[PDB]
Amino acid sequence: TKFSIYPPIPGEESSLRWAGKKFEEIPIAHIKASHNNTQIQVVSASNEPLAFASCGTEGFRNAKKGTGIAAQTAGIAAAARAKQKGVIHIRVVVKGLGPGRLSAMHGLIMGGLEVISITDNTPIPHXGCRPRKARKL
Amino acid sequence: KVWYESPSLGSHSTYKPSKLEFLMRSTSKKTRKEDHARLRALNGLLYKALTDLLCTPEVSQELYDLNVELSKVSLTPDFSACRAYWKTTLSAEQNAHMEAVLQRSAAHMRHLLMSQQTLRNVPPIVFVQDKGNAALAELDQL
Amino acid sequence: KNVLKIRRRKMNHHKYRKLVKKT
Amino acid sequence: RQFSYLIENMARDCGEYAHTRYFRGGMLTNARLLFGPTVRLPDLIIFLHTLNNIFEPHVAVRDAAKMNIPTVGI
Amino acid sequence: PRYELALILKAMQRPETAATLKRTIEALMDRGAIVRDLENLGERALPYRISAHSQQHNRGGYFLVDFYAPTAAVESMVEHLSRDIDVIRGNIVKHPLTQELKECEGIVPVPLAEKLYS
Amino acid sequence: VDYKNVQLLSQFVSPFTGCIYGRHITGLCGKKQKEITKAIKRAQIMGFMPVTYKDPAYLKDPKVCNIRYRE
Amino acid sequence: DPPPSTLLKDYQNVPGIEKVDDVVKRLLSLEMANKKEMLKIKQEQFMKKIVANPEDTRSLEARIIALSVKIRSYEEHLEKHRKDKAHKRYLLMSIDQRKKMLKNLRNTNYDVFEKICWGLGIEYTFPP
Amino acid sequence: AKHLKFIARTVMVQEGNVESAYRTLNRILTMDGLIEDIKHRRYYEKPCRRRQRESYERCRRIYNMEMARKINFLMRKNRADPWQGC
Amino acid sequence: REVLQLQEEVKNFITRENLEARVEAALDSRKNYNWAITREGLVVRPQR
RNA sequence: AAACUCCAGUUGACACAAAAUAGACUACGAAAGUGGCUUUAACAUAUCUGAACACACAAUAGCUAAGACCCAAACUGGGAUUAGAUACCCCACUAUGCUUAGCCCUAAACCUCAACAGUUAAAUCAACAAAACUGCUCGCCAGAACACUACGAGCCACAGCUUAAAACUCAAA
Ligand SMILES: [K+]
Ligand SMILES: [K+]
Ligand SMILES: [K+]
Ligand SMILES: [Mg+2]
Ligand SMILES: [Mg+2]
Ligand SMILES: [Mg+2]
Ligand SMILES: [Mg+2]
Ligand SMILES: [Mg+2]
Ligand SMILES: [Mg+2]
Ligand SMILES: [Mg+2]
Ligand SMILES: [Mg+2]
Ligand SMILES: [Mg+2]
Ligand SMILES: [Mg+2]
Ligand SMILES: [Mg+2]
Ligand SMILES: [Mg+2]
Ligand SMILES: [Mg+2]
Ligand SMILES: [Mg+2]
C-alpha cells in the first residue's frame, strides 16, 4: 500500500501497528519550544506522565537555554527516563517556533526513541489577547 | 502604472536574455533603470520552475522522496550559469544522498526545463549547497 | 512636502499649552 | 530586417538608394558635417516600413519633414 | 416568514428523542408557527466538544424543522431552546430555499488597471 | 450552496489547518467564494463542520483546488 | 395597523382566495410576513382614501403618501432603538423631504393639498 | 481545545525520515500562512500599519505577476537571429 | 399557481393530531444534504 | 512517608476581552466608520445647488457616575544603558482601551480631488500629483510672521472647543 502522511483516524480499521500498538496507543512527546527555553514531556496515551526534561533542568542558564544544543540535550534526557519506562515509539507534538523546535526532536531520536508522527500545536488565536506593543530597535 | 516605474520607451522591445546577446553588446552600455527588473523577475521565474519539479513525483521518483527545498535561485547576468541553493540536512550521511541524486538529476532537469519553451535557453544550472552551513558540518567531520 | 509650516505650528501650540499650564 | 536584403537589391536595380541599417543621429539634419558641405540630400524618401524595431516612428520621418523632403510611406 | 431550525439533540434513546421533538414542535405551534416538515439528518459525532447544561457532548442527533412563523416568534423560540436540557445547540435561520438564486452568465474579467487604481 | 452540505464545503478548506482557501486556489468567482465562506463560517459555529481541520471523512473527495502539499 | 388576518397585497385579488384552507390564509396573511409587507397594505389604504387615482404612483400625492408611511415606520423603529443615529438621520431627512413635497403641492394644487393634510393628519407649518 | 487531536497539522514519518517529515510540515504551515501569521502576532500591529502592509503586499503581487507575464510574453522572440547580417 | 401548489402542500404539513406519527416517521428515515463537486462542474452524490 | 511551593508541563472546566484563514475581495454607510454567528427592525428624496452658528451626526484621546477586567498600557516604580537618559531596551502595575447612561465635538476627520451636469474636439499641458476642460451653484482665499494667539460672544465644555484680529517686525515667506 502507498504511504499516507495523513494520520490514521480513530474508530476506523487501519492495518498500521507499532510493536503491536495502534496509533491511538502510542505515547506522546510534548515539546514546548519557546524563544528562551525548551520543555519536553513524554506522556502515555492515557495522559500518564513518564518523563520530563528542559534546558533549565539540564544545567543551562540564561541565553544558553535558548539554543538548539540545549534543547538537544533536554531531548536526550527525556528519552532516557522514558526508555526506562518502556517507550520506543512516540508521537511528537511541538508547540512554538523557538530554537529548540527541531533540535529537541533530534535529541529524542538519539536517545533511542522512534518518531512516528509530527504534530504542530503552536497556539494561534483567531482574533484573542492583544499582544505587547512593537519594539523600537 | 504604479510607483513601480513603467515609462520605458522601449517597453515593447523583445527581452532577449541569451549568451550570444552579451557578446554583441556595446561595452559603454550600462544597465538601465528597469533593466534589472527583468533580471530580478526572470530569476524568480527560475525559482518557481525548479520548485515544482522537486515536489512532483512524475519528474523523478528519487527526487520526490528526497523532498529537497530550494533556499535560493539567482541566475547570473552573464547568461552563462545559474545559481540554485538547496537547504542542507543535519545528517551528513543524508546530505551525501541528496547531493548525489541532485548532481545527476540536474542534467535531466535542464532538459526538463527546456520543455518550458519560454525558458528554453537555460544555462547549465549550478546546484550550490548552502543555507545549511555546509562548512559547519565539514568542520565537525575534521 | 516638507513639514516646516506644521513644525512652526507645532512649537507654537506646545509653548501655548505650557504657558497655560504654568499660569 | 526580414526585408533588408530585398530592399537593398531593389534600390540598386532601379538606380536609387537604400538605407535599411541603424539610422545614425543627424544623417539628415547634420548631413553636411557627416558627408561634407557639398553633399546633396535625397529629394524623396520612400518608407516601406515607417516604424523602427521598438515600434516607434522611424526617426527619419520627423527628420525628413525637418529638411523639407517629401516622404512616401506604407 | 419561512424559517429552518437546525436542531442538535442530546444523544438519547428513541423514546426520549421523540418526546424532545414533540415537545420542541409543540413549542413552535404554541408560538403561532405552522410546521411544514421534520427531517432527520442522523446521529453523528460533533465536529468538536460542546458543553451544554453542565454536561459535555461528543455525539448528537441532527434534526431540521421547516416551519412558518411570525417575526416575533423567533426571539421567543430561541429563548425556549436555551432552557431545554435535551437540546445541545439550536439555531433558527431564514429558510435557504426562500432566497432565489439569480442567474449568472459567467465570470466577467476585471480590468487590471482598476485593481491598482482601487 | 447550503451550510448543511459539509461535504461540498470541506473541498475548499485546508486538510491540515482548516484554513479557507482564497479564490486564487479554489477558482471560484466572487459570488460563490462569498457563499462558500459564509456557508463555512455558519456551518462551523452551528455544529456541522470542524474549524481547525478538514473532516477526515472528506479527504478522498474530488480535489478541485489548485494547491499541492505533500512531499 | 391593518389586522394580522389581512391578506398580502399580492394575494388579495386572486380568484378563490376566500375558499382555501384556513392554514393557507394564515400563510398569505400579514401575520406570517415581515413588517414591510404591512406597510404596503397601509400605503394602499391611504392611496385609496386620499388620491383621485389610486394607481398613479408617480404623482406628487402618491409620493407624499409613500414617504409618510416610511416616516411612520422610522418613528416606530426609533421608539425601540433610541440610540440608532443612522435611522434618526433617515427620519429627519424624510420629514424634510416630505415638507418640500408639501410645499410644492400647496403651491400647485391647494385642494389636493388639503385632502393630503386631512388624510395623513399632517399639520403644515411655515418655516422660521 | 475542543477539537480532536492528532488530525490538524499532523504529518506521519516515513522510513524514519524525520527531517523530510519536518520539512513537509513546515511547508504546510508556511503555505497556509500560519508561520507568517504567528510571526506577525508576536507584537501588536496597529490597524493603520496592517492596512498599509496589506495594501503594499497586494500591489507588489500584482506588479510581480504583471512583470512575469510581460517577460514570458516577450521571451517568445529569444530564438536565434533569423536574419543575421541584416 | 402559487396558491394551488401551496394548497396541496398543506395536506402534508405537520399538525397536532399527526405530530406523533410524523415524529416517529422521521426517526426511521435519513435525509442527506451532502454532495461533492468535480473540476468539470458535475455533482457526485454520496454512496448510499 | 510527609506536607508546603509564587512556579513549570500534559489533561479537563472556563469571559461583560478580541474577532486567524476567507480578504489576492474592494463591498456597505452621509461622513466618522464597518470584516465571528443568528434573528428582528432597516439603509431619505421621480429636478439640481443650498449653513463655522439652524437640525442631526462625527475616529481616537478626555470628563461624570455605576460595573467588568483576560490581555495591552500613559503615568509611576524597579533593572540596565549613558558624560546625563525624568528616553530608546527589560520587568511590574494604574488611569485608559470594554459595558451602561450622560457629556466633550477635536484629527494628516486626507482620494490633501466641493456638489450637480456635460465633453474628449480644441492648445494636451508652468511643475509634480491624479489626463485636460466646459456649464452651474454654494463655501472659501488675497505677502510672511505675530496667530490652532489676544479681546468679544456662544457652548453640560472652566488648563476646553468654535469664531478670530491688531500693534511692533521683515523683503521676502
Ligand atoms: K473570528
Ligand atoms: K457663510
Ligand atoms: K490621505
Ligand atoms: Mg513660533
Ligand atoms: Mg440638498
Ligand atoms: Mg455643512
Ligand atoms: Mg469646526
Ligand atoms: Mg466623539
Ligand atoms: Mg471612553
Ligand atoms: Mg484597569
Ligand atoms: Mg499585563
Ligand atoms: Mg480617515
Ligand atoms: Mg457643497
Ligand atoms: Mg497674512
Ligand atoms: Mg487645535
Ligand atoms: Mg483658543
Ligand atoms: Mg475668551
mmCIF file with all atom_site columns, N, CA and C (backbone and C1' of nucleotides) and ligand atoms in Angstrom, chain J residues 32 58-62 103-106, ligand 8:
data_model
loop_
_atom_site.group_PDB
_atom_site.id
_atom_site.type_symbol
_atom_site.label_atom_id
_atom_site.label_alt_id
_atom_site.label_comp_id
_atom_site.label_asym_id
_atom_site.label_entity_id
_atom_site.label_seq_id
_atom_site.pdbx_PDB_ins_code
_atom_site.Cartn_x
_atom_site.Cartn_y
_atom_site.Cartn_z
_atom_site.occupancy
_atom_site.B_iso_or_equiv
_atom_site.pdbx_formal_charge
_atom_site.auth_seq_id
_atom_site.auth_comp_id
_atom_site.auth_asym_id
_atom_site.auth_atom_id
_atom_site.pdbx_PDB_model_num
ATOM   1  P  P     . A  J 1 32  ? -15.014 58.515 6.146  1.00 0.00 ? 32  A  J P     1
ATOM   2  O  "O5'" . A  J 1 32  ? -15.094 58.596 7.734  1.00 0.00 ? 32  A  J "O5'" 1
ATOM   3  C  "C5'" . A  J 1 32  ? -14.579 59.716 8.437  1.00 0.00 ? 32  A  J "C5'" 1
ATOM   4  C  "C4'" . A  J 1 32  ? -14.968 59.675 9.892  1.00 0.00 ? 32  A  J "C4'" 1
ATOM   5  C  "C3'" . A  J 1 32  ? -14.662 58.376 10.619 1.00 0.00 ? 32  A  J "C3'" 1
ATOM   6  O  "O3'" . A  J 1 32  ? -13.315 58.287 11.046 1.00 0.00 ? 32  A  J "O3'" 1
ATOM   7  C  "C1'" . A  J 1 32  ? -16.879 59.034 11.091 1.00 0.00 ? 32  A  J "C1'" 1
ATOM   8  P  P     . A  J 1 58  ? -22.414 60.200 16.789 1.00 0.00 ? 58  A  J P     1
ATOM   9  O  "O5'" . A  J 1 58  ? -20.970 60.497 16.195 1.00 0.00 ? 58  A  J "O5'" 1
ATOM   10 C  "C5'" . A  J 1 58  ? -20.473 59.773 15.081 1.00 0.00 ? 58  A  J "C5'" 1
ATOM   11 C  "C4'" . A  J 1 58  ? -19.358 60.523 14.401 1.00 0.00 ? 58  A  J "C4'" 1
ATOM   12 C  "C3'" . A  J 1 58  ? -18.218 60.967 15.305 1.00 0.00 ? 58  A  J "C3'" 1
ATOM   13 O  "O3'" . A  J 1 58  ? -17.263 59.945 15.527 1.00 0.00 ? 58  A  J "O3'" 1
ATOM   14 C  "C1'" . A  J 1 58  ? -18.926 62.791 13.988 1.00 0.00 ? 58  A  J "C1'" 1
ATOM   15 P  P     . A  J 1 59  ? -16.981 59.398 17.010 1.00 0.00 ? 59  A  J P     1
ATOM   16 O  "O5'" . A  J 1 59  ? -15.672 58.507 16.838 1.00 0.00 ? 59  A  J "O5'" 1
ATOM   17 C  "C5'" . A  J 1 59  ? -15.661 57.406 15.944 1.00 0.00 ? 59  A  J "C5'" 1
ATOM   18 C  "C4'" . A  J 1 59  ? -14.260 57.022 15.540 1.00 0.00 ? 59  A  J "C4'" 1
ATOM   19 C  "C3'" . A  J 1 59  ? -13.268 56.774 16.662 1.00 0.00 ? 59  A  J "C3'" 1
ATOM   20 O  "O3'" . A  J 1 59  ? -13.432 55.519 17.294 1.00 0.00 ? 59  A  J "O3'" 1
ATOM   21 C  "C1'" . A  J 1 59  ? -12.244 58.067 14.976 1.00 0.00 ? 59  A  J "C1'" 1
ATOM   22 P  P     . U  J 1 60  ? -13.465 55.430 18.896 1.00 0.00 ? 60  U  J P     1
ATOM   23 O  "O5'" . U  J 1 60  ? -12.010 55.901 19.337 1.00 0.00 ? 60  U  J "O5'" 1
ATOM   24 C  "C5'" . U  J 1 60  ? -10.859 55.173 18.945 1.00 0.00 ? 60  U  J "C5'" 1
ATOM   25 C  "C4'" . U  J 1 60  ? -9.601  55.989 19.113 1.00 0.00 ? 60  U  J "C4'" 1
ATOM   26 C  "C3'" . U  J 1 60  ? -9.330  56.538 20.504 1.00 0.00 ? 60  U  J "C3'" 1
ATOM   27 O  "O3'" . U  J 1 60  ? -8.783  55.583 21.392 1.00 0.00 ? 60  U  J "O3'" 1
ATOM   28 C  "C1'" . U  J 1 60  ? -9.004  58.247 18.920 1.00 0.00 ? 60  U  J "C1'" 1
ATOM   29 P  P     . A  J 1 61  ? -9.195  55.600 22.944 1.00 0.00 ? 61  A  J P     1
ATOM   30 O  "O5'" . A  J 1 61  ? -8.664  57.003 23.475 1.00 0.00 ? 61  A  J "O5'" 1
ATOM   31 C  "C5'" . A  J 1 61  ? -7.272  57.259 23.575 1.00 0.00 ? 61  A  J "C5'" 1
ATOM   32 C  "C4'" . A  J 1 61  ? -6.986  58.708 23.875 1.00 0.00 ? 61  A  J "C4'" 1
ATOM   33 C  "C3'" . A  J 1 61  ? -7.579  59.259 25.159 1.00 0.00 ? 61  A  J "C3'" 1
ATOM   34 O  "O3'" . A  J 1 61  ? -6.848  58.896 26.315 1.00 0.00 ? 61  A  J "O3'" 1
ATOM   35 C  "C1'" . A  J 1 61  ? -7.990  60.775 23.409 1.00 0.00 ? 61  A  J "C1'" 1
ATOM   36 P  P     . G  J 1 62  ? -7.634  58.518 27.661 1.00 0.00 ? 62  G  J P     1
ATOM   37 O  "O5'" . G  J 1 62  ? -8.394  59.861 28.046 1.00 0.00 ? 62  G  J "O5'" 1
ATOM   38 C  "C5'" . G  J 1 62  ? -7.673  61.053 28.318 1.00 0.00 ? 62  G  J "C5'" 1
ATOM   39 C  "C4'" . G  J 1 62  ? -8.596  62.228 28.514 1.00 0.00 ? 62  G  J "C4'" 1
ATOM   40 C  "C3'" . G  J 1 62  ? -9.712  62.044 29.523 1.00 0.00 ? 62  G  J "C3'" 1
ATOM   41 O  "O3'" . G  J 1 62  ? -9.276  62.189 30.862 1.00 0.00 ? 62  G  J "O3'" 1
ATOM   42 C  "C1'" . G  J 1 62  ? -10.578 63.034 27.565 1.00 0.00 ? 62  G  J "C1'" 1
ATOM   43 P  P     . C  J 1 103 ? -26.582 64.617 27.039 1.00 0.00 ? 103 C  J P     1
ATOM   44 O  "O5'" . C  J 1 103 ? -25.494 65.761 27.249 1.00 0.00 ? 103 C  J "O5'" 1
ATOM   45 C  "C5'" . C  J 1 103 ? -24.226 65.703 26.614 1.00 0.00 ? 103 C  J "C5'" 1
ATOM   46 C  "C4'" . C  J 1 103 ? -23.106 65.882 27.605 1.00 0.00 ? 103 C  J "C4'" 1
ATOM   47 C  "C3'" . C  J 1 103 ? -21.848 66.542 27.063 1.00 0.00 ? 103 C  J "C3'" 1
ATOM   48 O  "O3'" . C  J 1 103 ? -21.938 67.955 27.050 1.00 0.00 ? 103 C  J "O3'" 1
ATOM   49 C  "C1'" . C  J 1 103 ? -21.262 64.597 28.275 1.00 0.00 ? 103 C  J "C1'" 1
ATOM   50 P  P     . C  J 1 104 ? -21.752 68.772 25.681 1.00 0.00 ? 104 C  J P     1
ATOM   51 O  "O5'" . C  J 1 104 ? -20.194 68.667 25.382 1.00 0.00 ? 104 C  J "O5'" 1
ATOM   52 C  "C5'" . C  J 1 104 ? -19.240 69.171 26.305 1.00 0.00 ? 104 C  J "C5'" 1
ATOM   53 C  "C4'" . C  J 1 104 ? -17.866 68.617 26.033 1.00 0.00 ? 104 C  J "C4'" 1
ATOM   54 C  "C3'" . C  J 1 104 ? -17.341 68.811 24.620 1.00 0.00 ? 104 C  J "C3'" 1
ATOM   55 O  "O3'" . C  J 1 104 ? -16.759 70.090 24.433 1.00 0.00 ? 104 C  J "O3'" 1
ATOM   56 C  "C1'" . C  J 1 104 ? -16.975 66.571 25.320 1.00 0.00 ? 104 C  J "C1'" 1
ATOM   57 P  P     . C  J 1 105 ? -17.319 71.107 23.324 1.00 0.00 ? 105 C  J P     1
ATOM   58 O  "O5'" . C  J 1 105 ? -16.970 70.413 21.936 1.00 0.00 ? 105 C  J "O5'" 1
ATOM   59 C  "C5'" . C  J 1 105 ? -15.621 70.169 21.557 1.00 0.00 ? 105 C  J "C5'" 1
ATOM   60 C  "C4'" . C  J 1 105 ? -15.539 69.308 20.320 1.00 0.00 ? 105 C  J "C4'" 1
ATOM   61 C  "C3'" . C  J 1 105 ? -16.085 69.939 19.038 1.00 0.00 ? 105 C  J "C3'" 1
ATOM   62 O  "O3'" . C  J 1 105 ? -15.319 69.504 17.916 1.00 0.00 ? 105 C  J "O3'" 1
ATOM   63 C  "C1'" . C  J 1 105 ? -17.263 67.953 19.495 1.00 0.00 ? 105 C  J "C1'" 1
ATOM   64 P  P     . U  J 1 106 ? -15.070 70.479 16.667 1.00 0.00 ? 106 U  J P     1
ATOM   65 O  "O5'" . U  J 1 106 ? -13.491 70.450 16.480 1.00 0.00 ? 106 U  J "O5'" 1
ATOM   66 C  "C5'" . U  J 1 106 ? -12.630 70.856 17.529 1.00 0.00 ? 106 U  J "C5'" 1
ATOM   67 C  "C4'" . U  J 1 106 ? -11.541 69.843 17.775 1.00 0.00 ? 106 U  J "C4'" 1
ATOM   68 C  "C3'" . U  J 1 106 ? -10.868 69.279 16.538 1.00 0.00 ? 106 U  J "C3'" 1
ATOM   69 O  "O3'" . U  J 1 106 ? -9.889  70.151 16.008 1.00 0.00 ? 106 U  J "O3'" 1
ATOM   70 C  "C1'" . U  J 1 106 ? -11.361 67.526 18.053 1.00 0.00 ? 106 U  J "C1'" 1
HETATM 71 MG MG    . MG K 2 .   ? -16.581 61.888 19.508 1.00 0.00 ? 8   MG K MG    1
#
